[PDB]
Symmetry: D2
Subunit: 26 residues, 4 copies
């Protein structure tokens, strides 16, 4: 519910998508 | 191509998360 | 940056993932 | 199976978004 908590959770999701783009191709 | 099209959608979601993190900062 | 804006954007992302689960299989 | 494993990860992200929306509400 706090801005910093959301910033970190959103970053984790963003990074997981970044990794899945690579995994999808490998 | 299914893999290619899926990759594009993952990257679009990744981009929206990056933009939302920018919006959280301000 | 507002709670309601974020709630709607997060829902849109959630629903896109819901749709991609189906598209991945079809 | 790659498609199956990818599906699971999409559903996990979908679940986290649902939980974050619940956190935004409160």
């Amino acid at each position: 519910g706090n801005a910093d908590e959301x910033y970190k959770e959103l970053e984790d999701x963003q990074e997981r998508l970044r990794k899945x783009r690579k995994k999808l191709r490998s």
